[PDB]
Amino acid sequence: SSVPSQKTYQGSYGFRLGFLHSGTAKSVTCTYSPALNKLFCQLAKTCPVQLWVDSTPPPGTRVRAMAIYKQSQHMTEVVRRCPHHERCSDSDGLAPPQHLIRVEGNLRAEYLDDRNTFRHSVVVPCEPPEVGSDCTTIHYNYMCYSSCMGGMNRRPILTIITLEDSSGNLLGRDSFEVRVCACPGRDRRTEEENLRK
Ligand SMILES: COc1cc(S(C)(=O)=O)ccc1NCC#Cc1cc2c(NC3CCN(C)CC3)cccc2n1CC(F)(F)F
Ligand SMILES: [Zn+2]
């Protein structure tokens, strides 16, 4: 399949992502490593992702998420849920059972099967921050473990976040690596310790 770009692009509105500072306690359900540009999360749990701009884009702007394999030899393969999880009948009514990334808590979420590339994505409208807030937040859920055999199969993925106009034209792009695992805090600590060597 075709290769979606992963190149960081702030664009005219100064678009970029932000993450909470959740620490690495054993109980943490989602945690982000700036040093690794890597989000560690548990299966089907809330992953807050912040959206930052220097200036407000137009009404009708949307934000899309898509997963791609990070390694060169796998990037052309569609990232999808594994044979077990795509058959477990756990759709919320919007997400197709094959889709790895869901949006939590937004009834306006839309799911795309690309007719040409067969890649999956989920897109929502974006709005300015609530009163007293400086950014907006999307809550994502990842619906397979990184280790799921016949799906990601222990291969690392990136999530590409794109800011789009109402026609789908590119306004901005950012990305981060993702590991979906049972203990994100320990795994982040381990991978950051490995980095220190
Ligand atoms: C129904 O939706 C809309 C309605 C209107 S409106 C009521 O004027 O009719 C206008 C726009 C939209 N929607 C598109 C959007 C947006 C947006 C603005 C934004 C943001 N603003 C600050 C504002 C202050 N200055 C100094 C820095 C920038 C800070 C952080 C995130 C922000 N976002 C979301 C993002 F990042 F994804 F683009
Ligand atoms: Zn799975």
Numbering used by the authors: 95 to 291
Quote the study's own text.
The p53 tumor suppressor protein is a transcription factor that, upon cellular stress, is stabilized and activates a transcriptional program, inhibiting cell division and initiating DNA repair. Although other genetic alterations exist, the majority of TP53 mutations result from a single-base alteration (missense mutation), with most residing within the DNA binding domain (DBD) of p53, which binds selectively to the p53 response element.
To facilitate further design, PC10709 was cocrystallized with the Y220C-DBD. The crystal structure of PC10709 complexed with the Y220C-mutant p53 protein was solved at 1.90 Å resolution. This allows for favorable CH–π stacking interaction of the aromatic ring with Pro-153.
